[PDB]
Homo-oligomer: 558 residues x 3
């Protein structure tokens, strides 16, 4: 019979009506797609905790001994001729400053010098007692106490060279001291600076009963029992205290432990409603009250949050208050957890389940905006996909309905390669197609057959079965296809017009016979397209903007 290569494109004349049954195909009349289930999200109370920066504040008492002399008797009687060194000295502990601590009196006429011990006073006893008194000042936190505040005698009489009048003074000053986070040194309000740790001699090292230091003393007293009330003596508890003897003054302050006094964690904000969304390797806590999102590693890095013993007595109260407020429509679902974000902030998470009726913080806002946009885009894509699936199902149903007329057209539409088909029972049977000798083609110039009013609907063709020596007569179909049975006939009509398509050339029949071959493109080609004039997203550039120039910053000064 006829054999050869199988057709793969609509460019070579081919004929195929073989009765050999091929593959069997059926239309999938049942098709559907489901709807995704909503992914529920956990919620609960979220608390943040920024790093504290407020310095530690405590009160400190200072003692200082002042000795001054005036020598103004130049000529007959001069005034303010010259002044002495006025060197101040630390208060000695000969009486352990017990009288000063009593805030009642003190021993004047201090004796101390680098060369030899010499007593300086107003010509009185070496260990005379002078009653202290408070002096008012232009300060609400410096209750200075003065003894012998008036200037020296300064006789100003007729003296040859100068006078020798001099007095001594005892000074008790109350001030406030502040220390940084490391708590290794602190500076008082007056201005003095000392390089010792405020926390010592109480659950801390670098302090002992003997007095010894590099330029200091660092002496600790057990149950000092400071009266601490010069205006009205009282009976306070003998609290512990320490002393530091500098080169010119002595400072005293109560001893306290580093723990249970100051720890670096302060509450910033509380969000009664928050959403936690898991991810590949991190969490996401949403706080829409300030439009920010905090990310933390999946593992609860704060596995030992019991070291921060301070907050164990306040985070409980805040959580209790928040859950009491939210108890109307929410209940706890699990144990509390502590996380640690990359920015240095600590998060406290307490998941809650609904009850059935029956300055570097810009990246958080950026993350929030990105998450919102991504969620919106994903939801839109999901809806579009569902609509497309429904449309595809309907389209397939139409296709099946259309296939009931001629399966060959539908099969050639679905598969790019031309094929052939027939409705075996209720099942399409697909067979391949076979070409013929392209050179051996002959088309009659007249479609008018014998008799009358029975003219052929399509021109008759003759060809050879490829690699064979034989001739057959067929009728030209469509897309360069040959049909063995020539049953296409029609009644003759006056001024009949006909056109045919054959690859890049066309045939024209103004009458029952014509060969006005013209180009295929000469006839207009209609289009059925719904253009999608989509507009892409332009890409822009961002520029840094500074509110205040460097000139204004310099002009700010201090």
């Amino acid at each position: 019979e006829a054999s050869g290569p199988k057709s793969v494109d609509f460019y070579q004349f081919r004929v195929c009506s073989a009765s050999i049954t091929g593959e069997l195909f059926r239309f999938n009349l049942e098709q559907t797609c489901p709807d995704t289930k909503d992914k529920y999200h956990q919620e609960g109370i979220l608390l943040v905790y920024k790093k504290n920066i407020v310095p530690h504040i405590f009160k400190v008492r200072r003692y200082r001994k002042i000795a001054t002399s005036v020598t103004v008797y130049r000529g007959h009687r001069e005034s303010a001729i010259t002044n002495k060194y006025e060197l101040p000295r630390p208060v000695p502990l000969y009486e352990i400053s017990h009288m000063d601590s009593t805030y009642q009196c003190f021993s004047s006429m201090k004796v101390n010098v680098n060369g030899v011990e010499n007593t300086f006073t107003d010509r009185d006893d070496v260990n005379t007692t002078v009653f202290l008194q408070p002096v008012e000042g232009l300060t609400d936190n410096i209750q200075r106490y003065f003894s012998q505040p008036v200037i020296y005698a300064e006789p100003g009489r007729v003296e040859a060279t100068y006078r020798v009048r001099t007095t001594v003074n005892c000074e008790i000053v109350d001030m406030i001291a502040r220390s940084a986070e490391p708590y290794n040194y602190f500076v008082t309000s007056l201005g003095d600076t000392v390089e010792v740790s405020p926390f010592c001699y109480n659950e801390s090292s670098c302090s002992t009963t003997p007095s010894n230091k590099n330029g200091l003393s660092v002496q600790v007293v057990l149950n000092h029992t400071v009266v601490t009330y010069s205006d009205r003596g009282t009976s306070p508890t003998p609290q512990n205290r320490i002393f530091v003897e500098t080169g010119a003054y002595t400072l005293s302050w109560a001893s306290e432990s580093k723990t249970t006094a100051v720890c670096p964690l302060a509450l910033w904000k509380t969000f009664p409603r928050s959403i936690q969304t898991t991810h590949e390797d991190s969490f996401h806590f949403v706080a829409n009250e300030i439009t920010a999102t905090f990310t933390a590693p999946l593992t609860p890095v704060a596995n030992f949050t019991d070291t921060y013993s301070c907050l164990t007595s306040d985070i409980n109260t805040t959580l209790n208050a928040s859950k009491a407020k939210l108890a109307s429509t929410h209940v706890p679902n699990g144990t509390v957890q502590y996380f640690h974000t990359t920015g240095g902030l600590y998060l406290v998470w307490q998941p809650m389940s609904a009850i059935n009726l029956t300055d570097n913080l810009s990246y958080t806002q950026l993350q929030f905006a990105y998450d919102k946009l991504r969620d919106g885009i994903n939801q839109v894509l999901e809806e579009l996909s569902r609509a497309w699936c429904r449309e595809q199902v309907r389209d397939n149903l139409m296709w099946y309905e259309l296939s009931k007329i001629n399966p060959t057209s539908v099969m050639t539409a679905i598969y790019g390669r031309p094929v052939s088909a027939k409705f075996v029972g209720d099942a399409i049977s697909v067979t391949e197609c076979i070409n013929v000798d392209q050179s051996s083609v002959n088309i009659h110039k007249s479609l008018r057959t014998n008799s009358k009013d029975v003219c052929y609907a399509r021109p008759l063709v003759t060809f050879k079965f490829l690699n064979s020596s034989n001739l057959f007569t067929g009728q030209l179909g469509a897309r360069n296809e040959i049909i063995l049975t020539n049953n296409q006939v029609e009644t003759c009509k006056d001024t009949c017009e006909h056109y045919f398509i054959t690859r890049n050339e066309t045939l024209v029949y103004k009458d029952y016979a014509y060969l006005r071959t013209i180009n295929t493109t000469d006839i207009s080609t209609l289009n059925t397209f719904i253009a999608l004039n989509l507009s892409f997203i332009q890409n822009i550039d961002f520029k840094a903007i500074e509110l205040y120039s460097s000139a204004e910053k310099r002009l700010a000064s201090s």
Copy 2:
């Protein structure tokens, strides 16, 4: 007849050809959707106003009296043996400093002491007049004036103990003072600090003719008429002035009101082109020159912008200049308005209508980017929806065209539930379908009927009308459907092959009679689907980045 439950799925054999007319349906041949109208947006000139931080600057004049003594005559003749207290004193107002104000001379030999009034001088008159003079220095803003600048006599002769030579000095210093925003205290360039308000005795309280203060004087003089020109005397206006007598010096400066001198609002930028878009409860002003967007509440919070009386004379000029520049293609459309953003910046809005031919600022940039992305996405969605509507209209038209062959298939395609329909006149009439007894089914194993070449196209079936005792003969259709009229016949063909679908089982007829029952899935099922391999949007994490570490910040120091 036959009655029972109505079919709801393609799983039970059913037959329905009832002549009772049901509901009437017609194809909506006319369908269309409109295009949304563009929402025009207001535009106009927008000006921002940041909070001023530049400190107030004004000139201040200082007067001070200096008395010093030198006693160097130790042994035979010593030098620099000792110095006096050199205590400086404020300039007294015995002459009301009129001579000093004249910048011509001053009264030397000042007499003042805490004990008793003693006059110190170079052994001259108590009220002797000494002419002032200017002294050059290494400063471009300190025109210090000195009288008696040379050191004391210091005889250095043969004296037993020391000398008594001493002189006095009058000092006039011109300096510059700066004050913070509250204007409650200020510090001069020299270094002195005073806790009085720079604005006083002129539209301000805390100032009166009597001199009285807590450690100060705060004296006001009416029409002081300061010459203010030591190099060349002039005749200036008698401007008002005030004085403050400290413990060692006196400061003077001209009095000015708090208003009309310094107010905290400075212009930052001007945008001749901006867009205002309304929202649910806020406005949105777009400034694309710096890629930022400012949001303000809907209500014009700056309802009393007349309090800032300073800007009423400059915002008018800037607006006039901008509108003069833009008058080529724009004209004003409404009255000016003032807003107040959440960040603390003040906005000035002046809408303009086109003329017909015939450091915390990152959130603004974030808002700008979010708005741009949202607008682009919304526009894309609108275009997609319009294209989808056009496609749906065309699809409905194609469905109506297809319905002209057999309405039953189209109706069963549109409605999931199988139905029976027909073309009454030019309107489809749909009727419900009725099942039969599933158990009472019988299919003949041979489709070859009597005579020859008239074999049945489909096998004949027999069943009972559900809840009834009767038998009927029908022909099997498709999707388990029965047809009463058995007119499906065809010419007998040798080696005829047939297949049929019945729920999960199939029938095979290799000849005019066969019962090779096989599974339905044995035959391949072709697919007609255009997969939408959409790619979702991945979610990433942002990390904080610091340009300079804390070590570099510490190394910066001052």
Copy 3:
């Protein structure tokens, strides 16, 4: 014949079956769309370079002469009665400080005074030599050297007025000095401030052999050969040095050029993998390790990066190391380039080609996020467009397949205006349509014709050919269309029902004749629509958030 206006809508009765051939149209059986080619992107090593802010650090040596006296013999024998001026003086260059530089001895008894040269000492020779020695202190960077450290003699014997004991001291202090970026002035660690440039007398101006300045000296010495080792004398190289003689002390430091010592560019980070994407007028370098993107102008603004001569010896090493590490799978492709971003950072770009197997930084993160979102959206749009093109091609094929039954319906579906078409061979010919006289219309109330069981399928109509005086008989079709040939007949059926449509009115035929005219809307209209319930993107507002309030900032203090 019949002529008049051409129909443009389905609202007027029209008839058109003209034999005149119109335009020729053919179905474009071949249609396809291509897939976009991936745009490859360059990659290579990217290095950033922030502006350096670390101040310059160098060592400085200071010399100072101190003279002090004590006069304490008041009464019989007093102590610390008074002190002298203790005026310090700069070390003179009588010996050019050669002995001090030798760190072995120095000439005591300095003679200097404003009045007349007087020698002060401990009653010794004017040019006596005293050996220097080092004194320990509480500092790890101040190796102070002291000569005559003990206090003056202070006889304290029985003297009438006072003593005259006095001593002099030579001080050599080693300190560290730091200077800002402009390098015009610097301040030492001790506290002294000098307004001279650290870089002078070596590839710099403002320095010369003669000593002259405004209050200073600025003297340069060639090959000073400072021993610089008091603990153990050595033999160092005679390096150059300079001196500055202040009013009380002299400072010395080694001279160095501004270049080759300190230049303001420090490496911040290195990214072995980066992507460069071109744009309209700028580049885009992606560094996903910190999620940031840097933008630079298209032109290599750093066209003269050879001025920064420091980095030419280190950027080469870093690039060599990075390319050695990446040589496993990458090789260089071009020459190095230098860019300059808008934020003030400098970028170094070195493109690399893969080898074939055979604190203001938020805007960068914002740009990165925007670019990622834009790329994702664009990719999604491209995929959607490709899927839509495939669907459109399939739809057009289905339309062509459907057109084989009746071209009139397909043509009227594609073109809104009704037309008339008829297949012409392979192609088709579509003509226009002509209306008739709307008033001249008559529809028979009975569709039952002569004989029996041959009743008309559609009612017969009679009308006039618009602007003409004639009558014709036709059959009503669909959408107000008239057909000349009345061949629509059917067998008579009992209880026949027929509804027909006509603009806004309908006809009902309960029997072979009826005129129950009712409204068209009375019959239900079925719909075939797949709703696209797209959800738009909500627009939100961002609010500025401050981590630490101003109160905490004030409490931080210093």
